Short mmCIF file of C-alpha atoms in Angstrom, two decimals:
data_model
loop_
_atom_site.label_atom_id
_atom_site.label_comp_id
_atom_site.label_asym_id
_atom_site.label_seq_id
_atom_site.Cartn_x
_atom_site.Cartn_y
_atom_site.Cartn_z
CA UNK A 1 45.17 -5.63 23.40
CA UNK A 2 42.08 -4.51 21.46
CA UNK A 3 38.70 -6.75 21.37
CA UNK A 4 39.80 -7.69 17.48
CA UNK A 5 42.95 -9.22 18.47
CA UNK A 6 41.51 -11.56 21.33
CA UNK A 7 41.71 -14.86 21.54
CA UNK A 8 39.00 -16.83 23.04
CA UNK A 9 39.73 -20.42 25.52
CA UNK A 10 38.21 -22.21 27.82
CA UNK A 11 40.06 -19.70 30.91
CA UNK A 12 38.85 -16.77 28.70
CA UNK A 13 35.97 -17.57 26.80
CA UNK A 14 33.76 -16.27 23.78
CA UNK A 15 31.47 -14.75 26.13
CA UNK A 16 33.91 -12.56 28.17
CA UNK A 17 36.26 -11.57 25.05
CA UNK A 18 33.32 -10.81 22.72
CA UNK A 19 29.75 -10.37 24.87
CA UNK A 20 26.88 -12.49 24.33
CA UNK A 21 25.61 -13.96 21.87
CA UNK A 22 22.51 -12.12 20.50
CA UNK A 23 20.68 -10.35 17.30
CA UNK A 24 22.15 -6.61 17.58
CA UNK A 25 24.29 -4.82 15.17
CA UNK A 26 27.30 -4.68 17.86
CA UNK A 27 26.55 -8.53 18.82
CA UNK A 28 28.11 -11.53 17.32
CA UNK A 29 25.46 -14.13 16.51
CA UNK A 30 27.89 -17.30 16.20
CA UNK A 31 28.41 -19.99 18.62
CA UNK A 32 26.54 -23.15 20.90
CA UNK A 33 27.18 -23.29 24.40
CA UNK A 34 30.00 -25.66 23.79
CA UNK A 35 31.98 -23.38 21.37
CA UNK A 36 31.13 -20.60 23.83
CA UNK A 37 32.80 -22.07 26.67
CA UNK A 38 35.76 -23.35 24.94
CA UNK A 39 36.66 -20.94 22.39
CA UNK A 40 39.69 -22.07 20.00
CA UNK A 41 39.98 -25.39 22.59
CA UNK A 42 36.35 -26.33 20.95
CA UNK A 43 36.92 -29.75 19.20
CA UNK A 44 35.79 -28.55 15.83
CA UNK A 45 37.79 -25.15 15.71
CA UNK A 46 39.85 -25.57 13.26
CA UNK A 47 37.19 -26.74 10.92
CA UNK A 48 35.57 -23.51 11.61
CA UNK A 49 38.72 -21.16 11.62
CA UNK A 50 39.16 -22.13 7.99
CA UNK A 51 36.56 -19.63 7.02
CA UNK A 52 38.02 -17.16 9.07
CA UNK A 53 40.11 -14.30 6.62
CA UNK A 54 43.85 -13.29 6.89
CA UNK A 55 44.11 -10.00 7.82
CA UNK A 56 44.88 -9.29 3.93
CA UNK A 57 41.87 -11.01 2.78
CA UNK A 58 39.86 -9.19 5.07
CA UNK A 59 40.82 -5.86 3.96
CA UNK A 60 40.75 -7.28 0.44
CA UNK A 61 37.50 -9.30 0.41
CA UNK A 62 35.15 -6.80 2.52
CA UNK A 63 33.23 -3.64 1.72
CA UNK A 64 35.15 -1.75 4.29
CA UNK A 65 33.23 1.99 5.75
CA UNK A 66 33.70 4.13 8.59
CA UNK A 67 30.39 5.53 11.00
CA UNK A 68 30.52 7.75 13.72
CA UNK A 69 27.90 7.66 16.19
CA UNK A 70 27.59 8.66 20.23
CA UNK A 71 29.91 5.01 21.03
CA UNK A 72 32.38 5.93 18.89
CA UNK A 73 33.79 5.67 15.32
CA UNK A 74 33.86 2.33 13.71
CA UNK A 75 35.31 0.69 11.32
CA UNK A 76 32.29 -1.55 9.54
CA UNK A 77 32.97 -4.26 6.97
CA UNK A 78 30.75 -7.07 5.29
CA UNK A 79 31.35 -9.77 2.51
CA UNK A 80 30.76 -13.28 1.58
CA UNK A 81 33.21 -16.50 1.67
CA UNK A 82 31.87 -18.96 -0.71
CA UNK A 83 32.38 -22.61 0.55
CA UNK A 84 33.38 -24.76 -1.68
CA UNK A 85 31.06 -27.61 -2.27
CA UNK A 86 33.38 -29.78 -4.33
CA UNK A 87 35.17 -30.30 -0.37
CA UNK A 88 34.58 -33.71 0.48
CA UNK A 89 33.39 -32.41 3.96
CA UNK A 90 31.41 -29.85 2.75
CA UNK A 91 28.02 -31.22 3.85
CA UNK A 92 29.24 -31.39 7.65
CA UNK A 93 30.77 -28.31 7.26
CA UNK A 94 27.37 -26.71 6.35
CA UNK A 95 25.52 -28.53 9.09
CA UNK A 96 28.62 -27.29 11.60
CA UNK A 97 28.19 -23.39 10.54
CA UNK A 98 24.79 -23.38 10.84
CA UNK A 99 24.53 -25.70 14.44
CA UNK A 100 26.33 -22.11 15.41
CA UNK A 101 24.64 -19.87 13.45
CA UNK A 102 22.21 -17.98 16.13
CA UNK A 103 22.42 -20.81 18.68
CA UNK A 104 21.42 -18.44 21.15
CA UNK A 105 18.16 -18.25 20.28
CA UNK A 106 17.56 -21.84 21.35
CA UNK A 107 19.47 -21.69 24.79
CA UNK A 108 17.14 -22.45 27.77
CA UNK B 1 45.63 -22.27 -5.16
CA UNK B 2 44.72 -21.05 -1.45
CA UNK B 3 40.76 -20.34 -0.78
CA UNK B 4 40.04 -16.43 -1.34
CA UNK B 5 40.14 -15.90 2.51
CA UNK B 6 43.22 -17.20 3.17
CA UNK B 7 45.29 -15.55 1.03
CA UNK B 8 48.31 -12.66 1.49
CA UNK B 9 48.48 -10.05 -0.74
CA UNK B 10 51.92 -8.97 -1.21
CA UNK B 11 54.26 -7.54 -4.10
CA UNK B 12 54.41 -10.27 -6.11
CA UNK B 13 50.39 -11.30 -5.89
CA UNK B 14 48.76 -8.02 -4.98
CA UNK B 15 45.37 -6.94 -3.97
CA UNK B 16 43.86 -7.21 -7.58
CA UNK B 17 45.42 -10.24 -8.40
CA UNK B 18 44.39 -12.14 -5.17
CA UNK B 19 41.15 -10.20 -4.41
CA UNK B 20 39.92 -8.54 -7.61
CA UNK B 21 39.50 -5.21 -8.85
CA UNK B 22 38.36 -3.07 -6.13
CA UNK B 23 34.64 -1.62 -7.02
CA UNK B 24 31.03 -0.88 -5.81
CA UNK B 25 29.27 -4.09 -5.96
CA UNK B 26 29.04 -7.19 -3.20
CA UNK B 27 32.30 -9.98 -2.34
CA UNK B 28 33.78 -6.93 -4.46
CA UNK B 29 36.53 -5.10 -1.97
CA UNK B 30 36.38 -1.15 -2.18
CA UNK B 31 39.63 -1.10 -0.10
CA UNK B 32 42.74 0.15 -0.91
CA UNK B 33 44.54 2.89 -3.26
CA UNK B 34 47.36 2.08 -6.11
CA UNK B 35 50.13 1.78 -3.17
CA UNK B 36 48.27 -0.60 -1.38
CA UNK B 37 46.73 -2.29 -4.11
CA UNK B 38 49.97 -3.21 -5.69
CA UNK B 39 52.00 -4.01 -2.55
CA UNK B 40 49.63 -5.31 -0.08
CA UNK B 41 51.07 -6.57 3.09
CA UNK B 42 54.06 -4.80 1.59
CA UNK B 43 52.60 -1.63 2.11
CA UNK B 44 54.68 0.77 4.36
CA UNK B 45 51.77 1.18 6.53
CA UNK B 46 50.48 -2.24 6.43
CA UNK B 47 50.45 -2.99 10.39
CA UNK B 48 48.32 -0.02 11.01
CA UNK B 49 45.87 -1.41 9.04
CA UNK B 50 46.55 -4.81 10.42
CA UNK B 51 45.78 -3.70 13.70
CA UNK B 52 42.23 -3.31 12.85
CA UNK B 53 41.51 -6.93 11.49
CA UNK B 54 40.44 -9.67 13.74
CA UNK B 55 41.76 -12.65 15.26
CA UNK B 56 39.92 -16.00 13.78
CA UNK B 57 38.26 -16.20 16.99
CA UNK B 58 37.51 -12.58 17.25
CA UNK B 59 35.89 -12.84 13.64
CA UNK B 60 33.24 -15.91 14.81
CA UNK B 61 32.80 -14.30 18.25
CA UNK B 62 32.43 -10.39 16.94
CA UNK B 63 30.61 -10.62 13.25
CA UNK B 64 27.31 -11.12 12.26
CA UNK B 65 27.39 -14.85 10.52
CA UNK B 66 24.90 -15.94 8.11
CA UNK B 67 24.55 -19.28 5.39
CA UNK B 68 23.24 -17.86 1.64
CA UNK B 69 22.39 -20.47 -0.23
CA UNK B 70 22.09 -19.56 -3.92
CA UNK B 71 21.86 -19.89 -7.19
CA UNK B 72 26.02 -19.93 -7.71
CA UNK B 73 26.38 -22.42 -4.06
CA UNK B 74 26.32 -21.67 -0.40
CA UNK B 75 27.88 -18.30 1.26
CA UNK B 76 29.25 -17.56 4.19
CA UNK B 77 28.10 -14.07 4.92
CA UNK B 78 29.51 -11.91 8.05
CA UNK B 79 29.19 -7.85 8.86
CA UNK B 80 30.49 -6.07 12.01
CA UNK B 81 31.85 -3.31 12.90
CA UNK B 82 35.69 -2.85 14.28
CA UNK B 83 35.49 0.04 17.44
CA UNK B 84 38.63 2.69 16.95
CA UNK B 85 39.87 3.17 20.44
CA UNK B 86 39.23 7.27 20.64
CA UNK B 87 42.25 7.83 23.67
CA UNK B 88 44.76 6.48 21.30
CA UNK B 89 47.41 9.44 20.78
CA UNK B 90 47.30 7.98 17.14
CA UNK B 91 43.40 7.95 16.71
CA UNK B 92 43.50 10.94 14.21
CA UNK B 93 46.23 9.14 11.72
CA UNK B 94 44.59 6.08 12.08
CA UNK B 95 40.64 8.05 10.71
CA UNK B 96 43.10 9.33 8.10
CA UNK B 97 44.86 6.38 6.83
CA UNK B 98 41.54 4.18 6.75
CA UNK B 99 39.90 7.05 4.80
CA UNK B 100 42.39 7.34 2.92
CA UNK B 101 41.55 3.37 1.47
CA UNK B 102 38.32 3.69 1.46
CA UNK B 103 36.50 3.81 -1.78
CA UNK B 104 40.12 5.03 -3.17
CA UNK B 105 39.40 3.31 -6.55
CA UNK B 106 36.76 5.73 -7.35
CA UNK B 107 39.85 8.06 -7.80
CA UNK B 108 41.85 6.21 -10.91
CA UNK B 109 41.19 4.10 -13.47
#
């Protein structure tokens, strides 16, 4: 199956579905050692997965391009999911997106 | 009701509907053209589109995240790039039919 349709676990984990974590156009920036390691088994997944789009909203919500360069031809897309602050949780939820937001750059 | 992400676009709530008009500008989707807009997961060709979008955990563990905080609230921003797998026998139809989506609106009204 492709690299978009993986699923990471703790047996198969963020690192060896997706790379590491870094700062690089082809690197994803998002996760602490914990949710590295564990993947969807992470203990707050599903409070993170709720930001994560349908395959229709993706398609529907992004600005969606094509690039070819030497690698290959990609399909890039970017967009914004507003959070919605009238959530009860949505103060944790902010502190949980950024604890993973470039974690890496803290790992010793 | 459902929040923007995690909504299906199908016949009877299509792309406009549950993702706004397609256009230029940012959180504003340039994908699609009046097939797709108006049937969305409906769409005859809808799981070779599919095939493209990520997993939830493929999303956090491929895309650039970011936090916006601003004026209207806080933002969850992400960019990345999907890789088209070049030894597919179907890589040319695939180049086509994403083309054929992209920036489509600036063809009709």
């Amino acid at each position: 199956k492709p690299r978009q349709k993986r699923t990471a676990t703790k047996a198969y984990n963020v690192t060896q579905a997706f790379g590491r974590r870094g700062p690089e156009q082809t690197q994803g920036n998002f996760g602490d050692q914990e949710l590295i390691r564990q993947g969807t088994d992470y203990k707050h997944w599903p409070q993170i997965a709720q930001f994560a789009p349908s395959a229709s909203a993706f398609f529907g919500m992004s600005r969606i391009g094509m690039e070819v360069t030497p690698s290959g031809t990609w399909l890039t897309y970017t967009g914004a999911i507003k959070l919605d602050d009238k959530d009860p949780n949505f103060k944790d939820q902010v502190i949980l997106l950024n604890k993973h937001i470039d974690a890496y750059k803290t790992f010793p």
